[PDB]
Design a protein around this ligand. Structure first.
Ligand SMILES: CCCCCCCC(=O)SCCNC(=O)CCNC(=O)[C@H](O)C(C)(C)COP(=O)(O)OP(=O)(O)OC[C@H]1O[C@@H](n2cnc3c(N)ncnc32)[C@H](O)[C@@H]1OP(=O)(O)O
Ligand SMILES: CCCCCCCC(=O)SCCNC(=O)CCNC(=O)[C@H](O)C(C)(C)COP(=O)(O)OP(=O)(O)OC[C@H]1O[C@@H](n2cnc3c(N)ncnc32)[C@H](O)[C@@H]1OP(=O)(O)O
Ligand SMILES: CCCCCCCC(=O)SCCNC(=O)CCNC(=O)[C@H](O)C(C)(C)COP(=O)(O)OP(=O)(O)OC[C@H]1O[C@@H](n2cnc3c(N)ncnc32)[C@H](O)[C@@H]1OP(=O)(O)O
Ligand SMILES: CCCCCCCC(=O)SCCNC(=O)CCNC(=O)[C@H](O)C(C)(C)COP(=O)(O)OP(=O)(O)OC[C@H]1O[C@@H](n2cnc3c(N)ncnc32)[C@H](O)[C@@H]1OP(=O)(O)O
Ligand SMILES: CCCCCCCC(=O)SCCNC(=O)CCNC(=O)[C@H](O)C(C)(C)COP(=O)(O)OP(=O)(O)OC[C@H]1O[C@@H](n2cnc3c(N)ncnc32)[C@H](O)[C@@H]1OP(=O)(O)O
Ligand SMILES: CCCCCCCC(=O)SCCNC(=O)CCNC(=O)[C@H](O)C(C)(C)COP(=O)(O)OP(=O)(O)OC[C@H]1O[C@@H](n2cnc3c(N)ncnc32)[C@H](O)[C@@H]1OP(=O)(O)O
Lengths: 262, 267, 262, 267, 262, 262
């Protein structure tokens, strides 16, 4: 049981809890409350004993263009700038990043197009990623926005792409392109479908997943994930706290607001 | 430069940045915005190159009775809505404040000294346990962490600080059964570095006397060494504190959302 | 549901799962299968959603004199000495130590008299310890038996008694006496009752516990323990594996067997 | 000095301690006592001051098909009892063997080289992933960890070794869906240091050719440097491996005791 | 302010602190005091608030052939062999490795040819590496010199090249060649220029860097690096201390000196 | 085999390797080369298979007053201040601290009077400490000398005395007195003998040790220590490297030299 959100839906099909970003006209840009909603859906999936896999799917040509700048401008009532940003940015980010970090079900991202910023951080926290075609990329534009690492990217990017690649991309605001994703095994399967039909891609992933789970003992999947998660859980939780608190001086100084308004 | 707050003041005297909780009629109970203010003051002290020591002092017979329950009830009565869910409300009201103020203490680079003029409770007691040095007014001080009785869990880094400073077995006895860490336990674990043995009716005299002794003790010291040493000492547990901060604040949410603390905060 | 064991019983009273060592004529010395049984009882308590506290109580004048030497002599069928000790010692020790380390309920030991060896290791893994009187002590006689640290004592003893004290006691086979236990806050309450009535002591602890839990929100107790456990869980699990494997060369060399037979 | 085992032999040639799995008709499937024997051989090599490299070689078209299911069925049919409970049985049969052999690999101080003459499966594949260097016979080798299909979880340190050597996302795809780590994935992650590109019908020629190249490569090296370097490299993940060993072996128990793997091991 | 060194110069251009190894006739082999000098330059760059990037460039056909053996022979006054090597090797290595490990500016290496030994260790500690052409390699000849890992290679090589590749190269004294560097993303861009003009390569890298920093908020770069560094800082500091002390027995035994003399 | 040193002797008696500081007229103040010598003696004891305990004893009324200031003034040939202090301070500290941290034999300190500075740091690295009488203290005067923590005190002091006590003593240059030592179990036994006869104290400790080892299986002592050491070995090695490098800016700035001259 949870409120409805017009930008994000979910459903359950057998052992699969499927979350769908459904706002393609705005490239599935997300506001603060939408990130919170996403975290609440993960927590709902996590409490359902019939769910073994949580699948995140999107719509249109982008997975998500990241945080909604119009919503950010609306957040610019509180005794100080610090208090405002603690409520609007710190809170949201620590909550949703935490929901991904601790999630006990196998978390699969269907990457139907590019992801940017905090949405791309969340993709990097998923356990398995499938791409629609070779035009997908991840962009973390923090240096261009006057921000720093978010959503656990301090840990996930070096871990999944290597340290030297991560510095080149983050320091100079360059994308992690399809080729770098394939070379680091970030994408487990490219479906090579046209960008004009995310829907067909999403259905095809689900169809393959129904085939792949046949005969598996699903509690083994969760048992294995529980052990695998313990390799970096501490580093992720440490990073979440420091990222969110260290970002405050950037917001309070004002640079991101200037730049979020080109 | 910072706004004023009627419940907390500060001043600078030489190398000392002094923070004073000044609401003794309410036992220096603090609302969310006051915890935030406290974190902002630490960050202000941390940026001031003339400050080597940040001293936290209070007033009256309590250091602080903890989070203000009236303010907590305000975050439940509406007051428009103005939140799409209970989760969203508690993320903004509890998660955010706690993660911010705990972090300000954990990372503080100046020597952080607590003048314990009476008991401390809850999140305020957690902050006392994050200070580097603690002086007590007399042997009637105690720390109480009443999480089990409020339907909550560890806050303000107590997951790490209590076992570290009081031992694990003592921590379980106190936290599981809502029992205070009393003066004798504090002294036996070296938590209190000096008991001034003054009457509880004059926090003001105690506070002045601590400052007077501190002015004497710093004479002849090379103060950048103090900071250099703290910078190394902090690295022993910094990772564990930062990890605990994130986890404590997120794991509390289900307790707030379930509603138990609100029932219990009501008497 | 579990088999019966004549040396160890259990019962449930409200939120308390009570385990009772009931072989005072043999000072509650335990064989390998009894340590395993103890681990199985912990795991049973851990799965019961009505249990919040697991209380371990004993009988007579000793809590437990440790591993039963007669049973050890019986273990002296297997292709090698290594294989024998892997089955008899390694297996038992890793299993029972693990059951204590991961236990999610609040674990309380009623110390009715001295504990020795592996039984004393288990006492040091409990969250809270109450003593009957000031004659209790813990002895870890590994240096005298030709063995090394067991039951997580590599971590628990320095953690609960300090490093320098631990070296003095372990290197020279000296007890951790009541005074050192009180000074390190290892014992949370001394009941100051006569050693001739463990039964009255055990009942009195339970009576105080029923009083102390009134008004508490018990899920908070478990929530707090779950966070507290994460401080050292990794070090305990690492120690368990190394202790058990490093002990093998001592058993295979034969020294403990000579000495276990004075 | 050690007993003989008809399924595994060893010999020493100069600085090389060579272990050979010699039961190709059964795809070098191993029973519990064989895993133990393998650990004993590692410990023997580790104590020999003339040995600098421990080389593991196999026979036939498979490196090893993993744990022998017939032997597993023996540990279920009785065979007197002779165990007070299912838990006690599995502690002795599974827990004990796994924790011992995994530990022998994790702590081994000599350079550990695997000659991969064909596929490896299960616990045997876990041991391959614990070796320092791996050479393949041809591009048809693969590693399979079929835990999800057997109703089990990670074994032999794979909790740590697979994400470390293949990356996290690749590891989840393979483990969650019971898919092999194929040659191409092995090459792309640098898991295989050299592919010899020889036919699968002659493991013997492959094994000899690896040894021949190794005799050439060690010429002129100061061999104590190899060991000194390994001693430092091992410290990067030694704690994580030891922690994982204990947890893997204990967490598997509920899967054995519940019975699922026995049903599934039966076809 | 710092003394001059004829083998290494530096200059500052805008946000770039540029260090130039300028002894191509000796393949930029470095003596102990030159490594120390290099550490001092990093520490100077680190204290300059206008510097955001520290760029290390070399000359000729080699980046650096490593420690100068003629200088080593000079070091073979002190009460013991141990005391001599503590002063000559331990001290310098622990200092320069530490300067690279803690450096807070973005550290970029312009790899104009091969690097060997301690110089190659320093290349592996840089955040970003650009290569002149596909003939560059790194060689860590410790096994052939009778030494062990240096300059944090205990951590940096498995981290950046993987553990199995690291064992093959280190155990058998084999280079990490261009192909292995590209496959692990160690090199972020190959400029594909001729080895006869390091100068042109160096100028071209600086030109591209000036282009890539345009529009970026440079304090974000440093903020991000400060978080990224925390992933492995503890392991690097631990390794530094252990590498330098464990190498002593190799120097004192004398093997490296015999071998440094062929 | 090792050279002789007039300020420090050693001998072997059965399983005991006994190191004796023998310069009471100068309160056993030690120069750099004497610290190095002390490290070499530990490494000699560590390589001797008949040694199970390494015992450090001193003479006169002080254990050691710390680093010899006259020797420090001599050290104030080198291209820079940095290079000088790297050779004189960094090198020696990193070497001797490492020798104590890694030592595999049981390390016992006979505290015949106060210890100061780096010598007191070494006392805090010993496994077991016995005091002559209740007038012993440890003083770490770093704040008064314009230095920072040394000899692993960053880790050993909070570990053995607690964090709040450590801040009070270090920040304000106050001694850890006998009472604080006894309350934290730092001292395992006070012999309560007069300060005018260190020799009798030293002989009495050895006599009690010969009595306490009787019947023990000494390889168990070492086996246990090897496991106990792993609890904090990484933190000690990390601290060693950081302490020695971070102290440099204090020496180079000059403050300690001014203050070492009163
Ligand atoms: C509390 C949470 C804290 C948040 C942490 C902050 C960090 C982040 O999440 S990063 C978000 C920063 N966003 C960016 O940097 C913008 C980059 N995204 C882009 O899409 C690029 O502009 C670009 C060039 C790739 C898009 O090209 P293009 O496909 O032409 O986009 P466009 O056609 O304009 O998109 C369609 C519509 O979606 C809207 N839209 C797209 N992205 C966003 C966004 N991030 N925010 C708001 N609206 C957006 C457009 O305004 C446009 O509206 P309309 O149809 O009315 O013109
Ligand atoms: C964003 C932040 C999230 C943090 C979440 C939770 C963390 C916490 O801080 S937990 C702390 C919650 N507080 C408590 O459990 C205890 C608070 N209440 C108490 O009064 C003291 O504990 C107690 C009982 C020891 C005081 O004893 P006593 O000396 O008798 O004082 P008492 O007479 O009760 O109070 C004196 C006056 O101060 C007021 N006051 C004292 N503490 C508080 C408080 N915490 N909130 C509101 N008012 C308070 C009283 O209401 C009373 O006012 P009035 O004169 O109008 O009656
Ligand atoms: C698979 C698991 C691996 C096990 C890990 C191994 C490490 C350990 O657990 S340590 C166990 C080692 N045990 C010891 O060192 C023995 C020390 N225990 C003692 O009780 C001491 O002998 C001592 C002096 C304190 C007891 O004094 P006391 O009270 O006079 O004992 P006592 O009167 O003989 O005890 C009563 C009976 O219990 C029996 N008993 C007591 N302890 C044990 C024991 N550990 N094993 C077997 N039987 C025992 C006695 O044989 C005696 O039998 P009876 O009544 O027929 O004479
Ligand atoms: C204490 C230890 C605890 C460890 C617990 C679990 C960890 C594990 O090791 S899991 C591994 C379990 N094994 C498996 O899942 C796969 C084993 N079975 C297989 O045959 C191979 O995987 C497979 C299917 C790829 C082989 O393909 P293929 O080339 O067709 O060989 P196949 O014809 O099946 O077998 C050849 C012969 O060797 C025998 N054999 C092969 N592997 C095994 C085995 N693991 N156990 C018993 N017999 C085996 C076959 O029974 C067959 O004998 P026969 O001539 O009498 O029919
Ligand atoms: N270092 C090396 O020289 C390695 O052996 C190697 C293989 C990388 C050199 O390759 P190569 O390009 O053949 O070296 P080369 O051009 O002969 O060396 C040039 C000069 O620099 C000197 N040099 C190069 N590296 C070093 C070093 N690490 N220490 C001291 N001198 C060096 C050589 O001794 C030679 O001196 P000279 O001209 O007086 O004979
Ligand atoms: N060191 C100290 O000397 C400290 O100041 C302190 C307070 C511990 C000394 O206490 P105290 O017992 O008064 O020292 P004291 O007996 O005067 O010193 C004896 C001699 O040893 C010398 N000495 C003691 N410690 C040191 C040291 N760390 N470095 C060099 N010399 C020293 C003194 O300079 C003095 O020399 P002299 O006899 O030529 O004047």
């Amino acid at each position: 049981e949870i409120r409805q959100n017009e930008k994000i839906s979910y459903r359950i099909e057998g052992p699969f809890f499927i979350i769908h970003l459904i706002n393609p006209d705005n490239l599935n840009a997300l506001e603060g409350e939408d990130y919170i909603y996403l975290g609440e859906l993960l927590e709902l999936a996590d409490r359902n004993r019939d769910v073994y896999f949580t699948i995140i799917q999107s719509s249109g040509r982008f997975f998500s263009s990241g945080a909604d700048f119009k919503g950010i401008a609306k957040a610019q009532k509180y005794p100080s700038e610090t208090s405002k940003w603690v409520s609007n940015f710190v809170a949201r980010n620590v909550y949703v990043t935490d929901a991904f970090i601790k999630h006990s079900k196998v978390l699969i991202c269907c990457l139907n197009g590019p992801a940017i910023g905090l949405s791309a951080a969340l993709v990097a926290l998923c356990d398995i990623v499938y791409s629609i075609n070779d035009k997908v990329y991840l962009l973390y534009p923090f240096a261009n926005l006057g921000l720093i690492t978010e959503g656990g990217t301090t840990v996930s990017l070096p871990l999944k792409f290597g340290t030297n690649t991560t510095y080149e991309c983050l320091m100079f605001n360059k994308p992690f392109k399809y080729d770098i994703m394939c070379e680091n095994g970030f994408i487990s399967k490219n479906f090579n479908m046209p960008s004009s039909n995310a829907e067909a891609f999403n259905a095809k992933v689900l169809e393959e997943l129904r085939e792949k789970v046949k005969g598996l003992y699903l509690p083994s999947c969760l048992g294995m994930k529980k052990l695998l998660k313990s390799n970096h859980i501490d580093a992720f939780n440490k990073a979440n706290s420091v990222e969110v608190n260290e970002s405050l001086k950037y917001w309070v100084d004002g640079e991101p607001l200037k730049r979020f308004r080109q």
